Amino acid sequence: SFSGYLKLTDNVYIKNADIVEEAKKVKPTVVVNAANVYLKHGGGVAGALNKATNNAMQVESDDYIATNGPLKVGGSCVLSGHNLAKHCLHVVGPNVNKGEDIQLLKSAYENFNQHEVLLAPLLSAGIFGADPIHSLRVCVDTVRTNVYLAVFDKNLYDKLVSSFL
Ligand SMILES: Nc1ncnc2c1ncn2[C@@H]1O[C@H](COP(=O)(O)OP(=O)(O)OC[C@H]2O[C@H](O)[C@H](O)[C@@H]2O)[C@@H](O)[C@H]1O
């Protein structure tokens, strides 16, 4: 039931939309969160997803960390999607603004290949400081399963869809 997406490649689609609103409407099997290793969902995609779950995502995440410890940069875990999706795949892109290696963005996107269909954001392209077009290119060149990208920012979307991949 994904609607209004622009096709980028065989398997990658993109839309200027809030991932929270897409998730609410579509109720996908998997929504991806752009997480940090502590699953502290403060802002951006994570903060918005968590707010939409009325903090249930954070409560669940705190138990996950208490049991298992921090994720790896480039790593992931599958948790509930609460009222938004069946599952949330929390994926940690590199925090390039804090010196983490941009190469780990490829490792981060590889987690998507474990799921047939995902609704996802551009990892690392916000507060983590990776160039957004680079994140999109890594996504296209790494993910082989079917990924529906929700780009909140209109100006960014318009630039991305007019750029070579
Ligand atoms: N509601 C939204 N829907 C779709 N895209 C969004 C939304 N909000 C932001 N974006 C875009 O989504 C992209 C990613 O922006 P970011 O969410 O910062 O993720 P990161 O991987 O760079 O930083 C991770 C940290 O962000 C959190 O604080 C976490 O808790 C982590 O600490 C950008 O292009 C945004 O414009």
UniProtKB/Swiss-Prot annotation:
| Residues in Macro domain copies | 1-165
Q: How does its activity get regulated?
A: Inhibited in vitro by GRL-0617.
Query: Any idea where this protein resides?
Result: Host endoplasmic reticulum membrane
* Reactions that this protein is recorded to catalyse: Thiol-dependent hydrolysis of ester, thioester, amide, peptide and isopeptide bonds formed by the C-terminal Gly of ubiquitin (a 76-residue protein attached to proteins as an intracellular targeting signal)
Q: How does it sit in the membrane?
A: Multi-pass membrane protein
Q: Report the outcome of residue 162 to L.
A: In strain: Gamma/P.1
What does the record note on quaternary structure? May form homohexamers. Interacts with N protein.
The UniProt function text for this chain reads: Responsible for the cleavages located at the N-terminus of the replicase polyprotein. Participates together with nsp4 in the assembly of virally-induced cytoplasmic double-membrane vesicles necessary for viral replication. Antagonizes innate immune induction of type I interferon by blocking the phosphorylation, dimerization and subsequent nuclear translocation of host IRF3. Also prevents host NF-kappa-B signaling. In addition, PL-PRO possesses a deubiquitinating/deISGylating activity and processes both 'Lys-48'- and 'Lys-63'-linked polyubiquitin chains from cellular substrates.
What is the protein name for this chain? Papain-like protease nsp3
Protein source organism = Severe acute respiratory syndrome coronavirus 2 (2019-nCoV)
